[PDB]
Amino acid sequence: AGLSPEEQIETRQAGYEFMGWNMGKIKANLEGEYNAAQVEAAANVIAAIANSGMGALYGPGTDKNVGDVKTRVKPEFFQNMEDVGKIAREFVGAANTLAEVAATGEAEAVKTAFGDVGAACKSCHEKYRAK
Amino acid sequence: AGLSPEEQIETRQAGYEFMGWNMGKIKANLEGEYNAAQVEAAANVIAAIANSGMGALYGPGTDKNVGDVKTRVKPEFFQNMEDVGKIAREFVGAANTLAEVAATGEAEAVKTAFGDVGAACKSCHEKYRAK
Amino acid sequence: AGLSPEEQIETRQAGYEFMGWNMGKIKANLEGEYNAAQVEAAANVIAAIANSGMGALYGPGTDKNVGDVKTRVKPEFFQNMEDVGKIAREFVGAANTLAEVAATGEAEAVKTAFGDVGAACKSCHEKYRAK
Amino acid sequence: AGLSPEEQIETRQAGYEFMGWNMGKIKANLEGEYNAAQVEAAANVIAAIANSGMGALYGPGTDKNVGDVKTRVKPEFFQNMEDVGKIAREFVGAANTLAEVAATGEAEAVKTAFGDVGAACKSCHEKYRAK
Ligand code: HEC
Ligand code: HEC
Ligand code: HEC
Numbered sequence: 400a401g402l403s404p405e406e407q408i409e410t411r412q413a414g415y416e417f418m419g420w421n422m423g424k425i426k427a428n429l430e431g432e433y434n435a436a437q438v439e440a441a442a443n444v445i446a447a448i449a450n451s452g453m454g455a456l457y458g459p460g461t462d463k464n465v466g467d468v469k470t471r472v473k474p475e476f477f478q479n480m481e482d483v484g485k486i487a488r489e490f491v492g493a494a495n496t497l498a499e500v501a502a503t504g505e506a507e508a509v510k511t512a513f514g515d516v517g518a519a520c521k522s523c524h525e526k527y528r529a530k
Numbered sequence: 531a532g533l534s535p536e537e538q539i540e541t542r543q544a545g546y547e548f549m550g551w552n553m554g555k556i557k558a559n560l561e562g563e564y565n566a567a568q569v570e571a572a573a574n575v576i577a578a579i580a581n582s583g584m585g586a587l588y589g590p591g592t593d594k595n596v597g598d599v600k601t602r603v604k605p606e607f608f609q610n611m612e613d614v615g616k617i618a619r620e621f622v623g624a625a626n627t628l629a630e631v632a633a634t635g636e637a638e639a640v641k642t643a644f645g646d647v648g649a650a651c652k653s654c655h656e657k658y659r660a661k
Numbered sequence: 662a663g664l665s666p667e668e669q670i671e672t673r674q675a676g677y678e679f680m681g682w683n684m685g686k687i688k689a690n691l692e693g694e695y696n697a698a699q700v701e702a703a704a705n706v707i708a709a710i711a712n713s714g715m716g717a718l719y720g721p722g723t724d725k726n727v728g729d730v731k732t733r734v735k736p737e738f739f740q741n742m743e744d745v746g747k748i749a750r751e752f753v754g755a756a757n758t759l760a761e762v763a764a765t766g767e768a769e770a771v772k773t774a775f776g777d778v779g780a781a782c783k784s785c786h787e788k789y790r791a792k
Numbered sequence: 793a794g795l796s797p798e799e800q801i802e803t804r805q806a807g808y809e810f811m812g813w814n815m816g817k818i819k820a821n822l823e824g825e826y827n828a829a830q831v832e833a834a835a836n837v838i839a840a841i842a843n844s845g846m847g848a849l850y851g852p853g854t855d856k857n858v859g860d861v862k863t864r865v866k867p868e869f870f871q872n873m874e875d876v877g878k879i880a881r882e883f884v885g886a887a888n889t890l891a892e893v894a895a896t897g898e899a900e901a902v903k904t905a906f907g908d909v910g911a912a913c914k915s916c917h918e919k920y921r922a923k
């Protein structure tokens with residue numbers, strides 16, 4: 400037995416929430432006093448989570464609120480699995496690049512790579528996440 | 531500016547929950563049909579989250595339940611934290627050097643070492659101590 | 662099980678105040694008649710207090726005035742703290758090793774590395790997480 | 793001509809209070825799980841403060857409450873500088889030994905050394921500190 404539908408929703412939400420925190424740290428470093436190690440660590444989280452196979456957390460029965468757990472996934476997500484697949488793979492590429500650039504310590508290159516990742520997060524949300 | 535106490539608790543819980551999911555995947559691979567890439571991806575999440583600086587999510591209002599958010603942290607946890615920030619590290623280094631130089635008895639070297647310590651006191655105050 | 666928030670604020674203020682007195686003695690020696698033993702003793706206080714783990718005095722509930730005790734700490738200070746405890750260091754080391762071993766693809770080595778990580782999770786929970 | 797009487801009282805109280813905190817940490821380590829580095833850092837504070845020349849903080853108008861500042865020094869202190877001398881030398885010797893033993897990491901040598909320091913604190917208080 401795998402994760403229940405409720406567990407799948409909770410778990411995917413956790414991964415997203417934790418990526419969001421790390422994105423926020425990168426933004427803070429870019430706008431304030433840049434800490435290269437801190438940005439590298441944050442970028443490594445985003446890449447690792449992007450590569451963690453979160454598609455497995457969108458099993459049958461996770462399209463609607465379950466128990467006391469509410470989901471913000473739009474029903475269209477499940478009917479567009481081929482496109483969700485494409486965007487997820489694109490997000491992986493962007494996240495990998497952000498980690499690579501972050502390891503160099505170059506804030507200006509990170510700023511560009513950070514923007515590309517942000518655009519991938521946003522593209523998926525526009526299509527598949529309820530406001 | 532930063533995460534509210536509620537957001538800090540939610541975010542640390544998210545990181546832990548997501549590690550738990552990835553640990554479970556490793557266990558499943560070890561007990562069943564081993565998928566090397568899957569285990570590698572899961573292990574990378576655990577390492578990235580372990581290195582993500584979650585100490586920043588254990589701020590002063592987060593020892594007790596907040597709003598609708600409940601925490602399971604014990605108060606004993608917090609005393610193991612230390613300021614690992616840039617200025618603190620500058621200060622410790624500078625203070626250690628001042629003691630070393632002072633042991634030599636050389637006033638001119640002490641004067642220089644003393645100035646470096648004073649600058650660290652002042653720089654922390656300017657940023658983190660109210661006037 | 663430790664210092665109250667009020668006691669923590671009082672104690673950290675005491676350490677800072679006492680460092681201030683010793684800094685003043687060093688300054689006086691530099692500007693007047695230099696006493697090497699006196700400067701060495703003062704510098705030793707500054708180094709010892711810098712190394713004394715005052716992070717343990719920045720616990721939850723010490724970000725604001727308590728009782729009749731007033732604090733001048735800014736809320737921004739706290740996010741720079743990290744768990745430097747034994748179990749955290751064991752965990753990070755174990756997690757890094759699990760990722761390394763997982764990259765080799767060798768399931769028997771992963772099984773061992775996975776167990777070491779699991780033991781670190783569990784040991785922190787036993788001490789610091791409510792059942 | 794230096795620290796005001798109020799500043800002298802405040803400063804000596806700060807040094808004592810901070811030593812007290814560090815003594816309490818050594819006691820906590822002995823009553824719980826022993827952390828050698830933590831005990832070493834605490835012992836170093838006690839030795840440094842013992843050696844810091846706090847006699848200079850017992851200037852003329854500091855035998856009584858001043859302004860808003862209250863003191864617990866007994867009048868006998870100022871008229872018994874020879875015995876205060878003896879106890880201070882017993883204390884500095886004991887504190888130096890505690891730091892030495894603490895650096896070895898040997899808890900048994902520490903518990904014993906800790907007791908000798910505590911006896912010196914207590915003997916001065918009995919004679920020269922108001923209950
Ligand atoms: C699809 C391909 C996505 C990508 C890439 C990213 N996100 Fe996402 N996000 C997605 C969905 C379908 C959902 C809803 C999940 C649910 O079941 O409710 C989300 C949700 C979030 C959230 C809110 C999580 C919560 O607290 O409930 C956040 C904060 C979030 N997403 C952030 C985020 C970031 C920072 C991304 C890239 C770095 C990212 N998302 C990518 C779908 C997808
Ligand atoms: C301290 C050094 C810890 C280590 C190492 C790990 N965990 Fe932990 N865990 C810790 C605390 C203090 C808490 C309570 C957090 C709170 O604010 O409530 C937790 C909690 C968890 C949880 C529950 C999260 C939730 O949904 O509320 C899980 C699932 C969890 N921890 C798992 C986990 C795993 C898998 C670890 C190692 C791989 C791990 N923890 C390490 C403290 C610490
Ligand atoms: C951060 C990295 C700091 C360093 C390094 C030093 N100080 Fe500090 N100082 C700091 C804070 C956040 C505060 C406020 C503490 C509070 O809870 O109110 C202080 C305060 C002081 C004070 C006033 C203490 C009082 O009686 O209220 C003094 C006199 C002081 N600091 C001196 C001092 C000296 C001499 C330092 C280096 C040798 C030093 N500080 C370093 C933060 C930090």
Ligand code: HEC
Binds near residue numbers: 838916917
């Ligand atoms: C004389 C030779 C002393 C030795 C040795 C120690 N102490 Fe002391 N202590 C002494 C005096 C005269 C006073 C009163 C000072 C005043 O002006 O009020 C004190 C006070 C303390 C206090 C209370 C300080 C406060 O917050 O107001 C503490 C906590 C304290 N002393 C602790 C202490 C410790 C831990 C010692 C050895 C390790 C120690 N004292 C030695 C005189 C002397």
